[PDB]
């Protein structure tokens, strides 16, 4: 109810890591369109790769290390040696597991937030000149052609240009 899945047919679309993109889907006289937003999608791809790399790179501490052998009168050291092994095993297993689970709810929220943040960014440009109609769509109060659509998708929509036309249509369309 806040934003939908841009019903892209299922293209090869974009770059790995995120296997998709944040974008638009318009409808004007000229026809319909699907466009992915570069500036936002790309930032996320950089972010999430930076994230995956940290999780991997920052380990890369290990050094040549091993495992040991004792005799029938060294049962105590042997078990001290196991306590160590298993101690580590429990620690990593627990952290690596929690870390992935926690950090996954994060990546997924991150995506949802970026999509919503994009909506707020378009809302910021249009203002008055459009009507919020749910499901992350704006209905324009002026004729918005492909050129005008493009200026929205790349953050250069000129509000004042259409304010007056929009004023008329809105005064006597909604209210």
């Amino acid at each position: 109810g806040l934003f939908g899945a841009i019903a892209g047919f299922i293209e090869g679309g974009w770059t790995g890591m995120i296997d998709g993109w944040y974008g638009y889907h318009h409808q004007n006289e000229q026809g319909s369109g699907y466009a992915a937003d570069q500036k936002s999608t790309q930032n996320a791809i950089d972010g999430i790769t930076n994230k995956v790399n940290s999780v991997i790179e920052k380990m890369n501490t290990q050094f040549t290390a091993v495992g040991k052998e004792f005799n029938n009168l060294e049962r105590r050291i042997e078990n001290l040696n196991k306590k160590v092994d298993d101690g580590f095993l429990d620690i990593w297993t627990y952290n690596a597991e929690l870390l992935v689970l926690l950090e996954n709810e994060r990546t997924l929220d991150f995506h949802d937030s970026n999509v919503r943040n994009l909506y707020e960014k378009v809302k910021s440009q249009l203002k008055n000149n459009a009507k919020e109609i749910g499901n992350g769509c704006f209905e324009f109060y002026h004729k918005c052609d492909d050129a005008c659509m493009e200026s929205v998708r790349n953050g250069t929509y000129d509000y004042p240009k259409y304010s007056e036309e929009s004023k008329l249509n809105r005064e006597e369309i909604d209210g």
Binding site: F3, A36, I56, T64, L89, V100, V115
Partner: protein, 328 residues
């Protein structure tokens, strides 16, 4: 009515991950953090192959056990591999002192070299070297003995005190091994060493130690009521070791010279050794070590990922295929 929707597109995917709040979410992409497979071979660490003892273990190889003679040796190794069929060690019943310590210190060696420390032909004119073999260590059907050690016996109703000492002019450490024999009865003492009240004294500048025959009755092992202990020691470059005895010395014949490595270890694997490289070696097989975790085996050698008991660890990076309740 010109209209614009903002939302997100997700590519086709079967990739599934878990989060704290959901159990089986389909995302468009994930990166596995877990190393969970191995090439199935014992490769080379530090660009060097492991020492591969064959039908025998480190004791049998270090001492010269006969079955072991069928085997090669190189001048260095990363680690050592014993197989599930390295049963041939100390063929004459007895105790290898600090066997575990020696095994540890030989796991990574740099310039192995076996040399004749005390040549048989010339080192013992007053003692008998010719005789002194046993069924316990037999080669080619006949009674024999270790290839690296020598069993000195009375030349004829006499074993005069002997005293020989090596000086170690090699540029590295020398590993000298010997043994002390414990006859099962005083009669045997006489037969062998002709010296009821005899002893063995071994002295480096860092190593004094006396030995005496623990003459006693015991169960047969490989048909021998007698025992022998095998001792060792690392001789330092300038230093000299000196042996001295009136009986019971399984004298050194060949010693070893080497530079001990940082600190490897021993792997017991029936896998085949191949000429590939590895940062991380496991007993069942080598593994990639670019990922931070691994579930193959806890007992590892190298710069290895952390052993974790997880089955899968997928880090989501993609978009959800089924949009979230939040987004609706």
């Amino acid at each position: 009515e010109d209209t614009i929707c903002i939302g997100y597109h997700a590519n086709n995917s079967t990739d599934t991950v878990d989060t704290v709040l959901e159990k089986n979410v389909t995302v468009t992409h994930s990166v596995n953090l877990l190393e969970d497979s191995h090439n199935g071979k014992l490769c080379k660490l530090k660009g060097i192959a492991p020492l591969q003892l064959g039908k025998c273990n480190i004791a049998g190889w270090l001492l010269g056990n006969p079955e072991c003679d069928l085997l090669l040796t190189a001048s260095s190794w990363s680690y050592i591999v014993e197989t599930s069929n390295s049963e041939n060690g100390t063929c004459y019943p007895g105790d290898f002192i600090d066997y575990e310590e020696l095994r540890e210190q030989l796991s990574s060696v740099s310039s192995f070299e076996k040399f004749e420390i005390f040549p048989k032909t010339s080192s013992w004119p007053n003692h008998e070297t010719t005789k002194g073999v046993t069924a316990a260590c037999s080669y080619a059907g006949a009674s024999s003995f270790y290839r690296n050690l020598l069993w000195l016996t009375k030349k004829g109703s006499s074993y005069p005190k002997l005293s020989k000492s090596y000086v170690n002019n090699k540029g590295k450490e020398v590993l000298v091994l010997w043994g002390v024999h414990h006859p099962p009865t005083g009669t045997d003492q006489q037969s062998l060493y002709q010296n009821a009240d005899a002893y063995v004294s071994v002295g480096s500048s860092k190593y004094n130690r006396r030995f005496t025959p623990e003459i006693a009755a015991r169960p047969k092992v490989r048909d021998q009521a007698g025992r022998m202990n095998y001792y060792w020691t690392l001789l330092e470059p300038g230093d000299t070791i000196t042996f001295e005895a009136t009986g019971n010395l399984i004298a050194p014949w060949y010693a070893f010279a080497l530079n001990r490595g940082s600190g490897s270890g021993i792997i017991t694997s029936d896998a085949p050794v191949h000429d590939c490289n590895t940062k991380c070696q496991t007993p069942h097989g080598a593994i990639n070590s670019s990922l931070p975790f691994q579930n193959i085996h806890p007992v590892t050698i190298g710069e290895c990922p952390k052993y974790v008991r997880s089955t899968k660890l997928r880090m989501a990076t993609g978009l959800r295929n089924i949009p979230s309740i939040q987004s609706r």
